[model samples]
Structure formats: structure tokens, C-alpha cells
Target: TTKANIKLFSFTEVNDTNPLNNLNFTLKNSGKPLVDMVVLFSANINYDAANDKVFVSNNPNVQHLLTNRAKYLKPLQDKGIKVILSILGNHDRSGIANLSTARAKAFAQELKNTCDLYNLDGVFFDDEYSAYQTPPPSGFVTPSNNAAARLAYETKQAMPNKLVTVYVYSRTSSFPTAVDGVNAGSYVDYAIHDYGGSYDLATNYPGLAKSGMVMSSQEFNQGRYATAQALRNIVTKGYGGHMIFAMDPNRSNFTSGQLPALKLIAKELYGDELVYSNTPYSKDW
Candidate 1:
């Protein structure tokens, strides 16, 4: 039967103090099992490589989030849920300077080692690299693309059994040639597009599901139906499964509430229960 593997992105504000509790509430309330989760870690880069404190935050709430994650890791592991450690880079132009092939490789190695120590599932990379090139916009590739791809490759090689994924903009028009599509595709286990405009995506990347990759859409918009239905049709046609962009714990929106509808959609496609129960987050209840 067709099933969903949902991805949840957590912010610092969300992760601090009550992160895990919030997560528990989200899962229980929605009655959905998270297939994968990406947790953002903010810290000082100059800190010692071996220091877990480098990942820990001074904020009590952040510490609570990490501690709670550690507590629930075993339960999630038992359920075969994939947990990814996502390290974000600077948001501005400075990221252009800090991001390089060598730096990417280093960051991957560091994250691998850290995940190994924690026995976590794998890693997810956000906008840790920029796709912009110098001066005038020419046809030249962005250095960040290679750098980020190299890192993802290194991490996968280090943990072949672990799940690894990288995020990219969904719209091809906005996609930077700087991002090495082939190289990135080769290194990472999955290329999940942070996409929008369901109609545009359906028009452009028409064969996304057939390509055996993942495409994502925001949770709260009228566009959700088009995107969700397009992917659902792909699944019905024997294509890849759709990875819902996210399931927000606190927020109430179209995307956030789409999971229940997705359960019905899954039943229509697979002729079996996609989720365990209609209860949403029930664990064998």
C-alpha cells in the first residue's frame, strides 16, 4: 500500500526547552508517525570538534530539546524512523565565503562522527551553502554546489546504511546552475526539493515521481491540493511516494491538517491503510 514518509523541520525557537514535548504532542495529536525529522543545530564553529557542547545550546529550552531527543531516540529507532542532524550555514553573503568543497567535506565528516556517537539515523543539510557566483552572473557554476555535494557524499560513504538527504529549491527557474545536479544526486540518498507553486512544479518537473526523487510543498496554502494530488497521481501510476513538506505541531493550516486527508488518499491509491490508524498518532493502539 502507498504510505507517507513525512519530514518535519524544527527551528531553534521550537527546539528549545520543550522541543521533544512539542514533538510528542504533535505526533500524538496528529496520530502520524514521522518517517524522518530534521533538527537544526546552532553553535560556535570554532569550538572543539570532540566537544558535544559545540552542539548544545546555552538556552535551557534548546538543552531540553536535545535531552528530549536523546530520550526518544531509542523509541524512534525501534520504529525505523529516520532522524537527521541538519547543520545550517549563515544566511547572508558570508556563507558564500565560508562554503567551499573542502569545508563541506569537513562538516560532513564532523556530523558523521557526531551522529555515530549518538547512534542517530543520518544527516540533513539545509542552506549551508550559497549557489551564487561572483560579479556578473555568467554561466559559471557556483562553488557551493560542489562543496555541499562533496560533504553529502562524504557523509554517505561514512555511513552507507544511514539515511542521507539534501534540500534544494523545487522550482527549476529559481534553481542555480551552481548546484551540481548530477554530483548532488550521486552523493545524497535523496534530493528533496523545497518547492512551491504546485501548478508550476507540476508543469515543469512533470516526471518528478518517475525520477525516483522527492518533492516537497509548504503546509499552509491553496496550492497544497494541486501539489498533493499531483504526487498522489504519480504514486497511483506506480511512481515514487510523496514526501509531505512538514507537519507543524502548533500551527493550524492547510498543510498541517493535510495528513488526515493524505491517509484517505493513500487508501485510495494503495487499497490498504497508509497510516496505522485513523487516530493519526496512535502507537499500536
Candidate 2:
């Protein structure tokens, strides 16, 4: 009989690390892959208020991987790991939780186009760094919980087959009500706990199940990996998932860090030793 295991999640900072490196890891016992999903650390949400257009923006490094998905992302998908795009607000007036309904719908289509163009998996929403205003500037609206719910609802409606995962942090943490007959819990595939919040559960977002809840999350690059006890608690608490932010191979003296971090998860929660093929994938162009 297979012992049910907690799902493993990671956020890869594509600027300095490769999302593909996650594929080179596995449990020694079942030969199962250690990572279940890899989030490309971020692409920005930029607004062209002058043109009344809100768009998804990627930097050179992010665009490099996006354009070369076949080389960087396909390998991970081939090995059964999911690839997700992390969308963050980039010091702009537009935010995940503040877009007007029409803007949100338009933005959802843009996200759908991105996934379709790359043949990628889904998206992870991180509502950070946006400069939302009090008066609701042009191309934007008041930052409301309902507005965010509508965005998730629209995104799910646009990409019904893909995921609409969210970081349970900041205003992104709450999805206050049903939008167009669907609640946040029904639309959101996973709502992950914030970093170092190993015991936190998202109760504000209703209709979400314990199965889609990530009760434990840690930061691997920042030196706080999930401990053995934490992993056990997640299972004991009956939470379905766990997350590690910043899974970078190039962090300084990484041997002193990521190695033991991964080993703890691999041995305690996953029931095996892990042989990380420690290869770092860097941006080429």
C-alpha cells in the first residue's frame, strides 16, 4: 500500500536559477520525483494607463525562458512536474486585487494567451510591489477582496483546464465571495501558506478543502527550510501540501544550505535520500 505523502512545491527565481533544475531530484526509495510543481519566480503586471491597457510583462531573463519554453520548460513537463508562472505587481497601479471587472477580464485573457503560447501549465498569483492608489487611478480600481475574487473567477473561466494557484499573503490572501456563481475555493487549485508560516491555514478563503491547503511553507535560500518536525506536523494536521520559496542552486556556499534543507524533506516527509543532480541552468541570451 502506498503511504499518502504531502505534495512538494517550489518557487524558482528564474533570474539567477533555472526552473529546469527541479527535475533533477527524486526520492531514493520509490524513485519518485521530489518536486511536484515549479513556479517561475516572477513576471510583472504592468499598466499602460495612457492606453488603458493592463498587460503581463516579463524581463529579459524571464522572456528568454518564455520564448524558449521548449528548451527550458518542456523537460520538466516531460518528467511529470508542473510549470507555473508567478505574476507579481511591479510597483504599478495595477494589482491582482485591484483591477476593475473589465480590466480583470482582459487581463485574464492575457494570462490565458501566455499559457497557451508557451504550452505551459498554469499561473501563481503573488500580489506584491504594486502601488495601488486611494482614488483608483486610470486603468485601475479600488483594491477590494471581491475584485480579486473576480480576477480568480475570470482567470479560471478563461483557462478552465489550467490552474489558478495563489500565494496566501497580503491582499492576495482573501477571496471574499462568489463571483459569477463560483467561489474562490472552487476556482483556486492551491492556496499556499506564506513563507515560514508552517502552521498557518487559510480560513478567510471559504470553500477551500484541506486537500488544497498548504499548511507549511519555508524559504530554502533564506536559510529556513522545513524541519523534520514541520513535515510531520503537516501530515498530522492533515494538510495536503507544503512549499519552499527560492530554490536557488547558485546561492552562496549553498552546500552549507540547500543540501541539508532538501535532505530533511527528502528523508523525513518523503521517506528517502535524495540525489540532487546539482546542475544550475542560467539564462543564455
- TM-score for each model: 0.60, 0.93
Stretches of candidate 1 above 4 Å error? 1-13, 16-63, 91-98, 128-143, 170-185, 196-212, 220-228, 236-238, 254-256, 268-270, 273-285
In model 2, where is the ten-residue run with the lowest total lDDT?
A: 195-204
Off by over 4 Å in 2: 1-5, 199-202, 283-285
Candidate 1 lDDT, tens digit per residue, 112-186? 676776776676556543334365132222544444445555666667787765555421222222233433334
Alpha-carbon lDDT of model 1: 0.43
The lDDT per prediction is 0.43, 0.82
What's the number of clashes in each of the models?
10, 0
